[PDB]
């Protein structure tokens, strides 16, 4: 019911100039599609996505991932499964494409592009950093308050990253032209995770995929693409799966590392599981790490040395065996996905591994994630944002309501510290509410920011804030 | 004279295994060279590569390049230029290609992979880390003296990060086999950017690019691949190039960022350059920045926002020319890079862009390199470096020659602290001089480490060397 | 009208140079925002001051300076050029507009405006607001300056209010310490008795003490008055 003509739209939301020349030029020989890999790789949001932390800790040289580490690992593997599909199961999948697409450099470079910007605009400090943004919001904006009984506030108090992610890479940028990064309509059509907003109801989607602010732009990526709304984007079943599949193996991978567990350990919660006792793929997982872990013990080696050996091992088999399984279920499916109507939820759930990824999910779950010190952190996280956010929430409303409640000499200086960008959009003339402008400003303040430069920023104001708090 | 079918040989140097059951592989349609790519990309070290430093401190959240950012931009500028020789330039480059190697397929992925292991090896505290480890190994290993006047010791009296790159992608991993990452024949000798040893004097090549202990390695290398001493394979030539432009239009990018320049001073520097004066690509790169930087002073930005986008434009501008101008020197003197006598010191050099890529080298030289916080934290670097490895061959010091000297509490102790997979490669008994294996474990030691790793241990050390000093 | 053009043309033109000196902009920067300036694309003053200082430029290059001291030599010599500009167009414009300075009604407000070196100024004005007064340390020392200040003028408060008008909230042991530390000539002058309401010589004690005061000497006083705050605050 979808052509792949639509879905790989090549054409940008930027209006070409007609003024430019031959000497301006900066294709070079490149697809849009890969130009839009390169715009995402060289992007200052990118190389900050170091600073920003995943699971653990990210300054113990551990070697363990961070935001950036796990953004190009998902990309590795969309690319791997782009050129499975673009080399191997063309015919399968692209039945219909006309031959101005080149599937063998724009699928490939498509997903790649969408798995390294999945994660570009989530708050710092993890997962638990949209969770104190959204409780922060929910307490500093409430429902019953006649300024914020609008159901469109909900974009507050349940924050999400993929919404700030699209806005960063649409609307957050330098110049205020509400073009941002100017990708291709195929790579933001592929980018939204969860195709409704907080206003619609759909029981599909539990997350909402974009903000208000960017209704009109999504409505224009869904005109220029064929989809509309609860349809997904058939790629972001594949980013998707690639981000769940990276995530899930190389938590465990850092969580036997990092010494929270062993991989005898993982090997008997795997063997034990109720579901995996009789799934093959967790079976022959498991059956060649062992086949590997017997010749590795048959040589010298620290204990330390045979558990990251047998982690690696373990690593490569699961990748391996997830991936194939992740591709035959694309494959297979691939008339659902192309369908107007399709109501899948995810990738893996329809493929065979999907008990060895719910299991490694449970694992990680229970090892790394509700560890002493991980939940420690998230504290401290947690404590740093709203602090840093009612610091900033002094400085910021009744900027645009009309109340002069800012006007402090603390106000001022708080308001200046924010980045110029986001003050530009900010006092821009919009038919947004007034409340939602200084939300937004406050949330796209807090989610640019990384972790050592929260902690600074937050000492800081800290610091000047001491007369005011007296 | 030299054939693609042996320079793109996919073999790889560890023996095949036979007892290898179907369900134990895990190619899954993948090309050799693109599993080459993921080893590279899933090692430990490409994941410490964030912790090293490249110019600038990390700990600021000015978003300046580290190793790990440095090395996927030239893996991303690699692999463009791939994808143009085998979608565009097939028939001029590639002749006589036999049918079962896939270009598109092999050639941007190789790029690629040489592009993100070209500095894997490197010391920690940048450039200044090798040269300090140099100045030590001149120090602690006098050439007049008999024990070390052979000119093999060489190899750490000049000591460089591409050897220890060779060495640790080929033998410096945990399980000792002298295989290492197993990477295909075509992935390491591209990966050797001065094909010749300490030993060999060679006027072609300044450096030398691997140690003692791998020359049969690379005889092996060479045998597999067509190549031989002195003589350097095609693509590194293409990876040198891509390096030379990121690190020189980066630096800059990374200098006006930090604000030790303008985008003004860049431009005037560009403009009185004695050879850009008249450059064809340095006129039209200060011709588009001109063009683009008044309709961007006719926006409201600040200056330094100002400054960030005039030069994002600047990089976006002169990475295009840079890349298509290697590009075209490449595909000009193709018969001379196949050629068994081939001279070429570099790619940048034949190409159009010489010019501007050494006014960039000059201006990051003037403005950032010797930079006085720069230089300062080089010093800081080489002390730290030094003290460590002072304290480290106290204890390695004689465990091969003879002596006891190593024998007291502190030696034993920071022997034991030195990775298992050191230790293990230096007791395996081998041909190599006592001497010579002491300073290899040495410099693998202190090679593997990064930045806030050698300082914590060289502050551990300092802690517990205080009785034994007094 | 002569002091006031000279302040400014001393202030707006070494702002610039320590902006350039303390590396928040560059010779090269001043140098096209002046150019790039609405006002001063057509001042035959700022024209003059530019071509000057690219003609000192390219023979400074062509010596071995480090970027730092090519920098500061043309900053030196833009500001030798502009502040001999300005001046010279400063007297000029007081010497033509005599009569009118000297007459009983006159409405000048400015002798650099009634000259040709008013754009120059009123751009190298623009410049150190955008390039030096809205820096962000600049701000952060300002807002660290007013904390500093305020404190200061609530723990003086605390020990003049009501000493003039009657009240005898004063009285603490803090309060007449703080009194005591006040400079004797602004006591004995608010202790003087005057035709001036009490609350206003209440507060102009007050800032007499605050406004003699040094930047190191108000930060000392805040810390000593502050650790001796701490009873009365509990
Ligand atoms: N610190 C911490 N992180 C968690 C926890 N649970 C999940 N995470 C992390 C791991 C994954 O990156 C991610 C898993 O959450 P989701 O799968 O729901 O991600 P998202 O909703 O963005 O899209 P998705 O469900 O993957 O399609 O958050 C937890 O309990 N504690
Ligand atoms: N901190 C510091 N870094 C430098 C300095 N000079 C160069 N670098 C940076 C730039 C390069 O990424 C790298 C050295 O560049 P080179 O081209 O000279 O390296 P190499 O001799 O191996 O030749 P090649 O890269 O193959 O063209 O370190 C310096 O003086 N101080
Ligand atoms: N820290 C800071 N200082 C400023 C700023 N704007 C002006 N100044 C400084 C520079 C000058 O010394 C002086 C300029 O203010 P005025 O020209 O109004 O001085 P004033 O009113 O005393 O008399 P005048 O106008 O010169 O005749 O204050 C600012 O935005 N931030
Ligand atoms: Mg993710
Ligand atoms: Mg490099
Ligand atoms: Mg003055």
């Known amino acids: 019911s979808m052509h792949w003509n639509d879905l790989l739209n090549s054409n940008r939301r930027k209006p070409k100039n007609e003024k430019k020349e031959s000497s301006q030029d900066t294709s070079k020989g490149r697809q849009q599609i890969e130009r839009d890999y390169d715009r995402i790789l060289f992007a200052a949001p990118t190389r900050r996505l170091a600073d920003k932390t995943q699971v653990f800790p990210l300054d113990k040289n551990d070697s363990v991932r961070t935001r ?66 959204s409780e922060w919001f929910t307490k500093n904006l409430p429902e019953h308050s006649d300024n914020y009984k609008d159901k469109i506030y909900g974009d507050f108090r349940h924050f999400d990253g993929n919404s700030q992610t699209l806005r960063l890479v649409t609307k957050l940028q330098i110049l205020n032209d509400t073009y941002g990064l100017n990708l291709t309509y195929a790579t933001l059509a592929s980018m939204i995770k969860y195709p409704r907003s907080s206003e619609s109801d759909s029981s599909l989607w539990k997350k909402h995929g974009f903000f208000l602010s960017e209704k009109d732009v999504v409505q224009d990526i869904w005109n220029n693409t064929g989809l509309s709304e609860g349809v997904r984007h058939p790629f972001t079943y594949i980013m998707e799966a690639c981000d769940d599949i990276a995530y899930s193996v190389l938590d465990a991978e850092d969580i036997i590392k990092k010494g929270f567990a062993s991989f005898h350990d993982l090997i008997d919660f795997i063997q034990s599981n109720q579901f995996c006792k009789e799934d093959d793929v967790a079976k022959r997982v498991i059956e060649n790490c062992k086949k590997i872990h017997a010749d590795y013990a048959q040589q010298k080696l620290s204990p330390a040395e045979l558990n990251d050996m047998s982690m690696q091992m373990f690593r490569v088999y699961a990748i391996a065996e997830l991936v194939d399984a992740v591709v035959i279920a694309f ?14 939820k995810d990738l893996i759930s329809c493929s065979s591994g999907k008990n060895l990824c719910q299991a490694l999910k449970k694992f990680d779950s229970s090892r790394g994630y509700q560890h002493r ?98």
Chains 1, 2 share one sequence.
């Open 68 to 133: 950036l580490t796990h953004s190009h690992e998902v990309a590795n593997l969309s690319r791997g499964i782009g050129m499975r599909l673009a080399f191997e199961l063309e015919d399968d999948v692209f039945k219909d494409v006309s031959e101005d697409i080149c599937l063998k450099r724009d699928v490939p470079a498509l997903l790649a592009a969408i798995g390294l910007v999945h994660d570009m605009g989530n708050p710092p400090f993890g997962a638990q950093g949209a969770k104190a943004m």
């Open 331 to 344: 494959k297979d499916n691939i008339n659902e996905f192309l369908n107007d109507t399709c109501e899948i």
């Open 373 to 470: 010190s991980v939940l420690k952190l998230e504290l401290e996280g947690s404590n740093y944002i709203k602090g840093l956010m009612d610091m900033l929430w002094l400085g910021i409303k009744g900027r645009a309501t009309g109340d002069t409640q800012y006007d402090t000499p603390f106000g001022r200086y708080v308001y200046g510290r924010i980045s110029e960008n986001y003050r530009r959009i900010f006092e821009q003339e919009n038919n947004l509410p007034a409340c939602y402008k200084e939300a937004q400003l406050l949330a796209d303040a807090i989610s640019g920011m990384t972790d050592s430069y929260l902690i600074a920023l937050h000492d800081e104001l800290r610091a000047l804030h001491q007369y005011e708090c007296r």
